[PDB]
Design an enzyme around this catalytic site. Structure first.
Site, short mmCIF file in Angstrom:
data_model
loop_
_atom_site.label_atom_id
_atom_site.label_comp_id
_atom_site.label_asym_id
_atom_site.label_seq_id
_atom_site.Cartn_x
_atom_site.Cartn_y
_atom_site.Cartn_z
N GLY A 168 7.41 -11.55 8.80
CA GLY A 168 6.58 -11.17 7.74
C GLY A 168 6.72 -9.74 7.20
O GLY A 168 7.10 -8.86 8.06
N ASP A 169 6.24 -9.12 6.25
CA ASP A 169 5.94 -7.84 5.79
C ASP A 169 7.61 -7.24 5.49
O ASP A 169 8.16 -6.15 5.54
CB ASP A 169 5.39 -6.96 6.72
CG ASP A 169 4.09 -7.44 6.87
OD1 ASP A 169 3.35 -7.79 5.99
OD2 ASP A 169 4.03 -7.69 8.08
N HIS B 44 -0.47 -9.37 -2.21
CA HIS B 44 0.59 -8.53 -2.81
C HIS B 44 0.16 -8.14 -4.22
O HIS B 44 -0.53 -8.61 -4.92
CB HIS B 44 1.92 -9.38 -2.82
CG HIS B 44 2.39 -9.86 -1.49
ND1 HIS B 44 1.94 -10.91 -0.95
CD2 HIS B 44 3.00 -8.93 -0.71
CE1 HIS B 44 2.44 -10.89 0.31
NE2 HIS B 44 3.28 -10.03 0.59
N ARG C 253 -6.96 -36.23 9.16
CA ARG C 253 -7.12 -36.89 8.18
C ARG C 253 -8.65 -37.13 7.55
O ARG C 253 -9.21 -38.04 6.89
CB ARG C 253 -6.62 -38.57 8.27
CG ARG C 253 -5.21 -38.65 8.58
CD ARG C 253 -4.87 -40.03 8.92
NE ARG C 253 -5.13 -40.45 10.16
CZ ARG C 253 -6.37 -41.55 10.01
NH1 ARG C 253 -6.66 -42.34 9.16
NH2 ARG C 253 -6.81 -42.13 11.49
N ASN D 177 4.65 -16.05 4.55
CA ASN D 177 4.51 -16.14 5.78
C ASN D 177 6.33 -15.66 6.21
O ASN D 177 6.84 -15.04 5.33
CB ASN D 177 3.93 -17.11 6.86
CG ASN D 177 2.52 -17.45 6.30
OD1 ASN D 177 2.06 -18.42 5.77
ND2 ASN D 177 1.51 -16.10 6.34
N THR E 293 -6.42 -3.28 6.04
CA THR E 293 -7.05 -3.10 7.26
C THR E 293 -6.64 -1.38 7.73
O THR E 293 -7.52 -0.97 8.79
CB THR E 293 -6.45 -3.96 8.66
OG1 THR E 293 -5.19 -3.66 8.66
CG2 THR E 293 -6.77 -5.50 8.02
N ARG F 82 -4.55 -0.80 10.09
CA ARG F 82 -3.95 -0.62 11.28
C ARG F 82 -2.56 -0.76 11.59
O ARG F 82 -1.82 -1.50 10.75
CB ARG F 82 -4.48 -1.76 12.00
CG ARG F 82 -4.12 -1.95 13.57
CD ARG F 82 -4.84 -3.06 14.42
NE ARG F 82 -4.47 -2.93 15.83
CZ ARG F 82 -5.03 -3.59 16.84
NH1 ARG F 82 -5.99 -4.81 16.67
NH2 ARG F 82 -4.48 -3.44 18.09
N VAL G 100 16.74 -0.06 -1.14
CA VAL G 100 16.87 1.41 -0.82
C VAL G 100 15.61 2.18 -1.30
O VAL G 100 15.74 3.21 -1.14
CB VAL G 100 18.29 1.90 -1.47
CG1 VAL G 100 19.46 1.21 -0.81
CG2 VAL G 100 18.31 2.00 -2.80
N1 LIG Z 1 11.11 2.16 1.13
C1 LIG Z 1 11.35 0.85 0.88
N2 LIG Z 1 10.09 0.25 0.85
C2 LIG Z 1 10.39 -1.06 0.49
C3 LIG Z 1 11.38 -1.68 0.28
N3 LIG Z 1 11.53 -2.92 0.11
C4 LIG Z 1 10.02 -3.27 0.18
N4 LIG Z 1 9.32 -1.92 0.51
C5 LIG Z 1 7.83 -2.12 0.43
O1 LIG Z 1 7.49 -2.45 1.60
C6 LIG Z 1 6.11 -2.92 1.39
C7 LIG Z 1 6.14 -4.64 1.61
O2 LIG Z 1 6.91 -5.24 0.48
P1 LIG Z 1 6.63 -6.56 0.02
O3 LIG Z 1 7.43 -6.94 -1.14
O4 LIG Z 1 4.98 -6.52 -0.43
O5 LIG Z 1 6.65 -7.46 1.23
P2 LIG Z 1 6.30 -9.01 1.53
O6 LIG Z 1 4.87 -9.33 2.22
O7 LIG Z 1 7.25 -9.66 2.49
O8 LIG Z 1 6.35 -9.85 0.34
C8 LIG Z 1 5.67 -2.78 -0.02
O9 LIG Z 1 4.90 -1.64 -0.09
C9 LIG Z 1 7.07 -2.42 -0.70
O10 LIG Z 1 7.10 -1.84 -1.73
C10 LIG Z 1 12.75 -0.79 0.53
O11 LIG Z 1 13.61 -1.21 0.48
N5 LIG Z 1 12.65 0.30 0.83
#
Ligand SMILES: Nc1nc2c(ncn2[C@@H]2O[C@H](COP(=O)(O)OP(=O)(O)O)[C@@H](O)[C@H]2O)c(=O)[nH]1
Ligand SMILES: Nc1nc2c(ncn2[C@@H]2O[C@H](COP(=O)(O)OP(=O)(O)O)[C@@H](O)[C@H]2O)c(=O)[nH]1
Lengths: 419, 419
Positions: B14-15, B43, B139, B218, B295, B297, B408
């Site tokens: 995730g994330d 999100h 069920r 997830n 959170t 954290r 990027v």
């Molecule tokens: N610096 C940087 N931040 C990113 C990049 N891709 C995503 N983020 C940031 O990382 C966080 C997580 O991205 P998100 O699209 O919400 O992740 P998801 O939970 O997997 O859908 C967000 O704050 C995005 O803006 C990147 O390529 N570079």
């Protein structure tokens, strides 16, 4: 890229004759797999008169050149597994060296004696299928990899889970120490058979050419998501369960065969739109010998339902069909097939998801002429009478899925293969 | 035949930045789908400064030309759904007419307030994900089709299930009548949105050309079967869950994009082979802003793990990758990537399924040179410094999967698309 697995799936509510198709295909398979479900259904394979019975094990293991593979989606009661294999060894030499030809995915969940016992109690309010899949979703269940690693850790977790069930079911007799002690013996026999199933299958898919067969359990209309819920099993009996239960992607699914009986049966209670609780249903029950072998109780019978077949095809994407028990209809002067559903006087395009609404549908039928001749000796499509051929073509035309096999009797030879 | 869906899946825990990829793809989609999971992750999508938040709803619904589709594999807390949508309407006009553009599969299960409450209690021993998937397998759970049909029947079943939880969790405060009365209000707003999802999707797959996008929730290593069990969610977050959660076959799966962060994070406890609980991990955490928004954290951070990536690819069959947060590594003079696992001094080919065994693996690393330059303004692969290009190529070469997108930076424009 790589090998693409062949899947055999039941298209209706079980007892379609999947074992008949698996028998033919397993003869030149290299690997035969279970992807979902447990040991709740038994099947018999006869070799040199000897009757071997399979419940958890893929029936294909009867071929000495196959490796049988139990996927991560399967749930395994260990006493049941060893009992099944040991009884087969008592019957004859057909399972000689089975321990060398069985691979168990270490991500499969274990069905405990207390899961089976809880299953009985819940029914009062018994293979433990509901309970083990509930523990799996709750993440409280234990897996083969846990059993074969640190037994102290395993034991600690086992006691927590056992005590949960005991505290929820005070009348449940649960022998925590005795089950655990038998598991110590069961763990030592199973250890050599337990391995990483994702890696095992990936290597088999991407190595030299191999014929890999997946034996679906249960049937489309018993699927936890897609079946007549809550009168369903607790696993996905549909094609997506091949992927989730074996950890392989959609591009490695090849042929997907839907096993379709020429009329319909249901074992338990639950909606059954084409049910014929009458002389037609009695004739089907009698000619198709539609009763439990381990219970003796008669199955509910009805006409073929092409509305529900099309629904199973929407989900499964069958590449071809095996149309079984066509010979049952040899005595029928006319045969009805369900082709549309009306609800409250109006045609509907979907299968009602709620059981009580499905119970209200009025089936619209097509009436087809019978052939009134014995087809049990037919071995080629050209040998079938015209009205039997036309029954097959009607199904093909309505579903736009070709029929690859037609069952005309119980024996291996009582089959026609069209291509 | 027919349209083939595009799937976006998280490859790690995730994330990873799936929302970034979904943002781009949803701009020309016709239908956006959820196939599995519930509302446990939020999100934010920004339009004209306005920050809209999505939890259960597919983020793609922000495009006015899309129909959002909630599949049968999804679990739906009704108060949460309406709260999420109503709050978005309070923020601005971006969700204007959302009720006209949301379709809910009638086979989806309902998360009740008591499931959420039980979730909290079980954790003591809170979106109700474990409990609702446990009721589904048992069920005993209730579905959207039940809510919108006979409410007497629904009410009877609801009371049985509620009373089960109450009798198992005496400390659980459960307002049976109050929840049920709010559901009467929730049922009337949701009725027009609830339909047969199998039929809906089948028609969309087989009608005129359509771009259908499935937003995975997830991630691969959180999958109930394939993740680091028991430190996983209770649904299949992998490609097979698209099929089981939407009731469509493997032949209708098209492109499957794996979203891979250029280094690794984990939120909770659980095995994490490349974890860097040190200055390297602190640098990743700081530059990647790796902390919970709801959170505060900090997330655990570590090097990219190509062993676990290859494992997720064995299961998912990615057709291409989106490699996100490459810019985080701009400050690194050298970068390590996990390329092999040793267990007890010996190289192993698989991912240990047991958590405690996975905890024992020694990762073998490849050390790659850093670029030590700011790439945040790069918009084409040719603009990347050589060592950044080579980092990307190393991943492509090791996994034999092409990289389609490189992230990027946070903004929409901060992306390179290679093909
Ligand atoms: N610096 C940087 N931040 C990113 C990049 N891709 C995503 N983020 C940031 O990382 C966080 C997580 O991205 P998100 O699209 O919400 O992740 P998801 O939970 O997997 O859908 C967000 O704050 C995005 O803006 C990147 O390529 N570079
Ligand atoms: N008369 C007749 N019996 C059949 C045919 N196909 C299967 N059977 C019988 O029907 C029963 C159910 O078949 P089986 O292969 O065990 O079904 P499964 O539970 O779906 O695997 C067995 O007794 C078979 O011998 C057929 O085409 N004609």
């Amino acid at each position: 890229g790589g090998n693409r697995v062949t899947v055999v799936l039941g298209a209706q509510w079980g007892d379609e004759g999947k074992g008949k198709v698996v028998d033919l295909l397993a003869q030149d398979a290299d690997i035969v797999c279970r992807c979902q479900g447990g040991n709740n259904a038994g099947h018999t394979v006869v070799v040199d008169s000897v009757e071997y019975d399979f419940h958890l094990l893929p029936s294909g293991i009867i071929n000495p050149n196959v490796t049988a593979f139990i996927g991560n989606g399967v749930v395994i009661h260990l006493p049941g597994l060893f009992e099944e294999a040991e009884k087969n060894v008592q019957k004859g030499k057909g399972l000689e060296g089975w321990e060398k030809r069985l691979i168990i995915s270490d991500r499969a969940h274990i069905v405990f004696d207390f899961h089976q016992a809880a299953d009985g109690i819940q029914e009062q309010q018994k293979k433990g299928i509901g309970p083990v899949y509930s523990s799996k979703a709750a993440r409280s269940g234990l897996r083969m990899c846990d059993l074969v690693s640190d037994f102290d850790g395993f034991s600690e977790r086992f006691k927590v889970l056992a005590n949960q069930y005991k505290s929820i079911y005070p009348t449940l007799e649960i022998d925590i120490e005795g089950e655990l002690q038998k598991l110590k013996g069961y763990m030592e026999k199973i250890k050599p058979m337990v391995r990483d199933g994702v890696y095992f299958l990936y290597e088999a898919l991407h190595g030299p050419p191999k014929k890999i067969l997946v034996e679906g359990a249960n049937a489309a209309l018993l699927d936890i998501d897609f079946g007549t819920y809550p009168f369903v099993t607790s696993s996905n009996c549909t094609v997506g369960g091949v992927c989730t239960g074996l950890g392989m992607p959609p591009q490695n699914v090849g042929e997907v065969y839907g096993v379709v009986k020429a009329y319909t049966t249901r074992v338990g209670i639950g909606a059954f739109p084409t049910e014929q609780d009458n002389e037609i249903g009695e004739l089907l029950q009698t000619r198709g010998r539609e009763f439990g072998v381990t219970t003796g109780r008669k199955r509910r019978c009805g006409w073929l339902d092409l509305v529900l077949l099309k629904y199973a095809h929407m989900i499964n994407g069958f590449t071809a069909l095996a149309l079984t028990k066509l010979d049952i209809l040899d005595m029928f002067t006319e045969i009805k097939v369900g082709v549309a559903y009306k609800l409250d006087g109006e045609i509907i395009p979907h299968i009602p998801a709620n059981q009580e609404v499905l119970n209200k549908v009025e089936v619209q039928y097509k009436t087809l002429p019978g052939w009134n001749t014995d087809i049990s000796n037919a071995r080629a499509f050209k040998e079938l009478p015209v009205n039997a051929q036309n029954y097959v073509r009607f199904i093909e035309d309505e579903l736009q899925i070709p029929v690859k096999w037609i069952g005309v009797g119980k024996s291996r030879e009582s089959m026609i293969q069209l291509f």
